[PDB]
Design a protein around this nucleic acid. Structure first.
Lengths: 187, 49, 124, 34, 147, 49, 225, 52
RNA sequence: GAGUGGCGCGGACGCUACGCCGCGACGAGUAGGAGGGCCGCUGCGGUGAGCCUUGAAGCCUAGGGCGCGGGCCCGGGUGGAG
RNA sequence: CGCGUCCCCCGCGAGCGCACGGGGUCGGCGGCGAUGUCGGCUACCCACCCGACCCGUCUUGAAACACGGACCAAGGAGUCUAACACGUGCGCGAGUCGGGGGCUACGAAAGCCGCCGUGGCGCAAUGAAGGUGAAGGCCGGCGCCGCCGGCCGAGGUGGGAUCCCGAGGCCUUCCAGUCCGCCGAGGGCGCACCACCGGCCCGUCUCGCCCGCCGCGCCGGGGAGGUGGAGCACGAGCGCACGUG
RNA sequence: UGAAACCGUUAAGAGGUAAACGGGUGGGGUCCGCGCAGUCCGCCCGGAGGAUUCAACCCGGCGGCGGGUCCGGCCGUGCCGG
């Protein structure tokens, strides 16, 4: 007998990973304890990121992890990725880095251990640094994916630089009418 | 051997879990040799199951 | 390791017996006989088990030895206690406390042992 | 882990002969029921 | 998997999840890409602009092999050779430039997107961009052409 | 490659490195309290005023 | 050694006890002060009205600061402007109550939800009765009963409102932190009027039980509390 | 009838296509018969190269 | 918090962590949408050292109960091979 | 309700007990008891009080003088294939994939090939096209050179989860004090992401000035300022499986 | 094997608002509790019986931990040498 709208009574975020991966599930068990029993905010951020889908924990490039750890105060601090660390082949110099990440690709391992760099795991990060003291938490480019070009205004709206879904691309595949003032119109 | 026993394989008498046997197991030619080998390695109670 | 090969056998084991909103496990060293990370008799390095004796009278206390655990023929040490009710339980309390061998299974082992002795005791 | 213990090798009479093979790293691969 | 589907939870429900006021009738807006310029005009104009009409010249017999020209950039140029060559090229003191045959790697043209690491190199490509060439003069190198 | 190398969180969560950097448990349960009308109930009115 | 250890723990416990007794004494002496403040407040208007009548002039007293608003009508068939103002007052249910302090802004908000509320100027007794019997705090957005003073002290410690007598003083004598003490109090879930209403639909002036009931709101507070 | 933003498709299924569906259950018996005929030939032209 | 100076052999329950526990507010609903089913049907891979001629399926029942419900489990009868 | 000490006026006593005290207990009782009685709600039959129109469907509106339905059992209706999009799980990752081919009972399965990746999709766009095809300042010599060179070099602003430094402080009868752990004034590095301003690439327009040579010409290259692009600005893709459209 | 519709007969009950239905009881049946002198569980006390019976100390075999840091082995998503 009270005027509430129940539209927004439920919250639609993740409390657990969808994955039935046991090793991921033991990391989540390990970091639920640290999120609860420390006044560290690092463990709360890392736990939340352990739940997120592959399209939400993207692959961090090696060159982003070189650049964001060569910055002014990031000296002998641990580079923490919740996703994966993919090798960048266009970079020539790799400094000594201390990396903790879920996945690391075979090329980026052999590359980072070639220098004096050390590669951790999250069970090691807990024993090494429980509160996340002396860490730089990094994310990969989340609007990197092809899918985002097609999003926003409708392609065929004035000032919409949106990629439409065409079968193939040529001269006769969606180039004619609303793309040139020669043929009818243009926005 | 916690995972193997949870499958229901009756292996509480196998001396080792890997049970890496000799290489002259492959030279055998009778089912009397094959059962007698499983008796001596104490894997027989899985065949009885 | 314990937590690893729990996440494999917690739902998909031979011993698991689900019916009537109740979940037991018919494991040879489970005591309290239920699906748990504690009482599971196969997972851990250290395991205590209480059985009725080979004959009628007595109990058998089973201690899983530290050393060789992929070695199932020599993994378990069995001892028998055919004494009075108090001196049977006192031996079990002295095997579990004074070796610091699963002190959380002390009280559960004494309750199980007492139930085995009360079972093999005649009806009027 | 990186513990590769020393697995024994049994005779045809079911007794541990002195011959030993080191447990290959295949058995330490991450066990994935999924 | 027929168990995980929506059909199995419409058993009991009358319309099977297609409405009561407007039914599930057969083809109530025509078949396929019909009504393009008439009653599906807004969908085509809004999400598929430039669909109708003619643009450009018709090339009757077109063979795709004559217009075959796979590109590489200066970014990934040193990856067609070993890391051994790059290391030993700096380790050598004579000033000898290692030779990168681009057509052996399966690229004809070299484009100039990339920063180049500072040592001399020869590039035996079939084509070259202007900025691509300039950057290899900038690093102190050659541009040999291939027929 | 393993996603976590050491899968013994039995050992890990009681190891001195982790146990050092924790906050104390809040293990006391606080059930609801029955509201006693302190205008009728003298002592509760004394507990407040 | 441990003789030292338990001696230190015993000292720290005794320190915590004497800190409790010191705070408790402050609650007693503030309640004794507020009693003295209320009696001299009460005497003054009788004095000022007497000395006015002795001269032969009039004493117009202060137009009251505090209002008590009761929602009398329900959720069904209600205008959107009347909806927004009713949920800005937090009267989201029939027979809910809140205190609102009178200014220029709040009176012009009251008169546009007029047929849905029965409001007036409360008594010291009514303010005592409501906050002691129906007193619930909005602690962690959870409606928790004010059984102790360590709820009010832990929530409203910053504004120097450390007990129930402080809360009742800041409500009654419309002080500085009325906003943070009124918004602390969860809206008062009153009963149905025992003895019935006169008529819900119409104004108080024309027989009914809606609109401004100046000093007569205290009678409605007794029957619903 | 088009719903929203989505690719504009032209499926080539306007003819009687169900009559001319060619299914590959032959494949592992086709591979066996080829390997058979291959070894048969390789034995036939006995000391000559198997490739020809 | 930590250092250097001025007799009796004892102690309930717990923690399927996908578990267990605590506090507060809420609960109409057609078309429609999602979740959870230890709701049910028929077949395949595993598994229950399952059940069964000392009586399987099936069927009948003023018998005994469980579950919010889908349904289900026991008793008695018939039946004869799963 | 101690004085031994800090002002303007005149830090640990000891017990025992009662309880309007973080939700009910009795250290109170009394009957009746083997074929005639005790319990058994649900379930068979019946009675009485209150309520109570017959389902399905289309409809603004159905109990309808709207249509379908006499009764019962068995059958009986969103499926499979191709395509696309988005979410989701898994594997590898600037890659990825043998699907066609070949090799050596279950099994027409599984295993393997790499000088079987042809090839597909991806890592480059834009133009109808011929085509072209993705960052720079400064410091000298030639208040200037087309350049000879030399050093360093993938932008800026604002907001930004975390991280970093630390003015001071966290006790037991004090005073210094050393080591770890902890709080915090204020101040910095700034992830992803968003908004804005720069810039680079292709098309096309306006204005103008210099450079090159086995081929001096209706040859080729270059600059500044707007402007059109499904672009670049240190990659996210591919394959498999599931879900909805 | 022998379902339901529908029918015959036997038993029980009922019957003027067509029947049937939900809620609340009361009345009678049908079987059930294999009902009908009524709970077991600790320790102690109070009497009475029995048994070859504790604590300690020898001899043996097995197990746990830590031997803070003994002696010898094997492993290393460890590293430095030849």
């Amino acid at each position: 007998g009270v005027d509430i709208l129940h539209n927004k009574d439920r919250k639609v975020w993740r409390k657990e990973p969808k994955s039935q991966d046991m090793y991921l599930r033991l990391l989540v068990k390990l970091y639920r304890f640290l999120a609860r029993h420390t006044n560290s905010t690092f463990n709360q951020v890392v736990l939340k990121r352990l739940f997120m889908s592959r399209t939400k924990r993207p692959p961090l490039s090696l060159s982003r992890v070189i650049r964001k750890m060569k910055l002014p105060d990031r000296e002998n601090k641990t580079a923490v990725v919740v996703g994966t660390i993919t090798d960048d082949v266009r970079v020539q110099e790799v400094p000594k880095l201390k990396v903790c990440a879920l996945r690391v690709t075979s090329r980026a391992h052999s590359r980072i251990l070639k220098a004096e760099g050390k590669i951790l795991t999250f069970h090691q990060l807990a024993l090494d640094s429980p509160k996340g003291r002396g860490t730089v938490l990094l994310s990969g480019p989340r609007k990197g994916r092809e899918v985002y070009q097609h999003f926003g205004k409708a392609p065929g709206t004035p000032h919409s630089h949106t990629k439409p879904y065409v079968r193939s691309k040529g001269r006769k595949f969606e180039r004619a009418r609303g793309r040139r003032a020669s043929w009818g119109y243009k926005n | 051997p916690a995972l193997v026993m949870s499958k229901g394989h009756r292996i509480e008498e196998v001396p080792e879990l890997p049970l890496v046997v000799e290489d002259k197991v492959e030279g055998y030619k009778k089912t009397k040799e094959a059962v007698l080998l499983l008796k001596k390695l104490k894997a027989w109670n899985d065949i009885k199951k | 390791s314990a937590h690893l090969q729990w996440m494999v056998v917690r739902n998909c084991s031979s011993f698991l017996i689900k019916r009537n909103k109740q979940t037991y496990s018919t494991e040879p060293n489970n005591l309290k006989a239920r699906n748990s990370f504690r009482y599971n008799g196969l997972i851990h390095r250290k395991t205590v088990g209480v059985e009725p004796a080979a004959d009628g009278k007595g109990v058998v206390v089973v201690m899983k030895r530290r050393s060789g655990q992929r070695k199932p023929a020599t993994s378990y040490v069995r001892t028998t206690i055919n004494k009075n009710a108090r001196a049977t339980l006192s031996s079990i309390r002295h095997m579990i406390r004074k070796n610091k061998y699963h002190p959380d299974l002390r009280m559960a082992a004494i309750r199980r042992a007492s139930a085995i002795l009360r079972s093999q005791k005649p009806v009027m | 882990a990186c513990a590769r213990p020393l697995i024994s090798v049994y005779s045809e009479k079911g007794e541990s002969s002195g011959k030993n093979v080191t447990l290959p790293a295949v058995f330490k691969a991450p066990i994935r029921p999924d | 998997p027929s168990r995980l589907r929506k059909t199995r939870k419409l058993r009991g429900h009358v319309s099977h999840g297609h409405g009561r006021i407007g039914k599930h009738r057969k083809h109530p807006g025509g078949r396929g890409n019909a009504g393009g310029m008439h009653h599906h005009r807004i969908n085509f104009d809004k999400y598929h602009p430039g669909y109708f009409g003619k643009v450009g010249m018709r090339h009757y017999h077109l063979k795709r092999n004559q217009s075959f020209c796979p590109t590489v950039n200066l970014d990934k140029l040193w990856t067609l050779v070993s890391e051994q060559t790059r290391v030993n090229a700096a380790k050598n003191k004579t000033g000898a430039a290692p030779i990168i045959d681009v057509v052996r790697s399966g690229y004809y043209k070299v484009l100039g997107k990339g920063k180049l690491p500072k040592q001399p190199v020869i590039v035996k490509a079939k084509f070259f961009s202007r900025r691509a060439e300039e950057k290899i003069k900038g690093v102190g190198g050659a541009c040999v052409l291939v027929a | 490659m393993h996603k976590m190398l050491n899968t013994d969180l039995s050992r890990i969560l009681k190891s001195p490195e982790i146990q050092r950097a924790l906050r104390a448990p809040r293990k006391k349960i606080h059930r609801r309290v029955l509201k006693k009308n302190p205008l009728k109930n003298l002592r509760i009115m004394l507990k407040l005023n | 050694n441990f003789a030292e250890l338990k001696i230190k723990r015993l000292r720290k416990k005794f320190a915590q006890k004497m800190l409790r007794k010191a705070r408790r004494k402050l609650i007693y002496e503030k309640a004794k002060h507020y009693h003295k403040e209320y009696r001299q407040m009460y005497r003054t208007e009788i004095r000022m009205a007497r000395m006015a009548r002795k001269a032969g002039n009039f004493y117009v007293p202060a137009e009251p600061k505090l209002a008590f608003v009761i929602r009398i009508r329900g959720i069904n068939g209600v205008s959107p402007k009347v909806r927004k103002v009713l949920q800005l007052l937090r009267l989201r249910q029939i027979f809910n109550g809140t205190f609102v302090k009178l200014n220029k802004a709040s009176i012009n908000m009251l008169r546009i939800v007029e047929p849905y509320i029965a409001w007036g100027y409360p008594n010291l007794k009514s303010v005592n009765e409501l906050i002691y019997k129906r007193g619930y705090g909005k602690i962690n957005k959870k409606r928790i009963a004010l059984t102790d003073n360590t709820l009010i002290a832990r929530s409203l410690g910053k504004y120097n409102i450390i007990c129930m007598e402080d809360l009742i003083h800041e409500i009654y004598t419309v002080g500085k932190h009325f906003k943070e003490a009124n918004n602390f109090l969860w809206p008062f879930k009153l009963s149905s009027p025992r003895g019935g209403m006169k008529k819900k639909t119409t104004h108080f002036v024309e027989g009914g039980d809606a609109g401004n009931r100046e000093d007569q709101i205290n009678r409605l507070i007794r029957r619903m509390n | 009838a088009p719903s929203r933003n989505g690719m504009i498709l032209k499926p080539h299924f306007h003819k009687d296509w169900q009559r001319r569906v060619a299914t590959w259950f032959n494949q592992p018996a086709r591979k066996i018969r080829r390997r058979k005929a291959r070894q048969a030939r390789a034995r036939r032209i006995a000391p000559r190269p198997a490739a020809g």
